[model samples]
Target: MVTAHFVLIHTICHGAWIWHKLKPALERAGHKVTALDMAASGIDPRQIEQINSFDEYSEPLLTFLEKLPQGEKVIIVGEACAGLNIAIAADRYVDKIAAGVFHNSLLPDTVHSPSYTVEKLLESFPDWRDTEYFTFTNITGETITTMKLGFVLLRENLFTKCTDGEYELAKMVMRKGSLFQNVLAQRPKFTEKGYGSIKKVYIWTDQDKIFLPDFQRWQIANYKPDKVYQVQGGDHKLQLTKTEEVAHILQEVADAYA
Candidate 1:
């Protein structure tokens, strides 16, 4: 049996707390699991105002990979925009990553700017409805755009199938998040040798309202992953809604990748 370490990154606006259920699920399956909060998300001390770019927001993951002892490679799993996180980390530490797994995420391609997938995301799902947006100057003198997702959108779109307790916890811990679109537009594309060459697995659901089915299909068509797993009935937060199914697929990831 392949016992692998899986590093999980949550969607934007959510902290590592979002993976609370999924982490223990994977661990019970006898795999090592590590979930982290990006710079400003979750319970991380840094506020959204301090995060200048997506790269900066992804600091914790990068730091963790950097500190990983040599020869220990991990499979990086991301939900939503965290796919961009996996891309960024792979670009820097390809040697330490076994695979990049997208859970209803933005599957970035090497052909466009770093922010290309997000650009498409905004175009595809233009209306955030009740979500609120704000702008602030970061420590680096850049005007960053951030948002606080509203409860209505959360209930109607993201947490459609989750329990009331899960939804309540999300409301309590939700934080501001940014796509850092402008910064990513100016940033270099992910290197071919790094992100492009790594194995990718795409997991998604048709019931995901926020990341619509159209956009998910487009991303898979756009960049094509090594494998794709589609689970029925769950909303965007499949990790919470379809815990065992996600864990089963992850075990497959460990087996195939290891």
Candidate 2:
């Protein structure tokens, strides 16, 4: 088995703890794994008020890679809304990251172009503001947002296949997410020598109800990464409920590119 450094990023409202299941599995296979908590996220002590921009919010993860030993490279994986952050990191630190995987997460290009796919998806979520769908949120003047997943919404959108204990644990640790609206509108200037240099992969969750299979397919068609992977029985929380499967996918990519 290939041994390499694997960094994990969770979506909004979740912390590095969400990768608990996958970390040990990768470790068992001789890979070093680290899941990071963004500023004002997970167990991070930063208050929402302290974060003024997405750059500051995502600084922790960026700083981690920036401080890495010279010549070290990592396979970065992002979940849900954290996809954009991964793209930025890849673009800025192409030399430090070997490859990236957008696991059941947002795809690139949407940040700059709101394609027909984005328009169609936004049409479906009427009450939700288009700008605030995933990137921007102005919840009663709180720029940094937090979401508490109620049982019904959790069952319907997130933990379709998760156990009661897994669901409960997620509830306990998940909270306080930033919309990163200011930065979402700002595009990362990726170049052939930077972001475009790194191989990108997309992991499609066929059973995911939140991001939706159609939307994922649209993203794959438009963004067109180097690789596409699908999890048949996986939901948004596939990393938790389908931990082994997720680990295997990560291993496959790592072995191919690392």
Candidate of highest TM-score = 1
TM-score of each: 0.98, 0.86
Worst 10 residues of 1 by lDDT: 137-146
lDDT of 1 by residue, 1-67 (tens): 6889999999889988989999999889899999999998888998888888899999999999999
lDDT winner among the candidates? 1
lDDT for 197 (candidate 2): 69
Q: Which 10 consecutive positions of candidate 2 have the poorest summed lDDT?
A: 127-136
> lDDT, candidate 1, residue 120?
94
How would you encode candidate 2's per-residue C-alpha lDDT over 136-250 as one tens digit per residue?
2344353434334455666667777888888888778866565555444443444556666688888867788777877788788876899998877867888886889888988
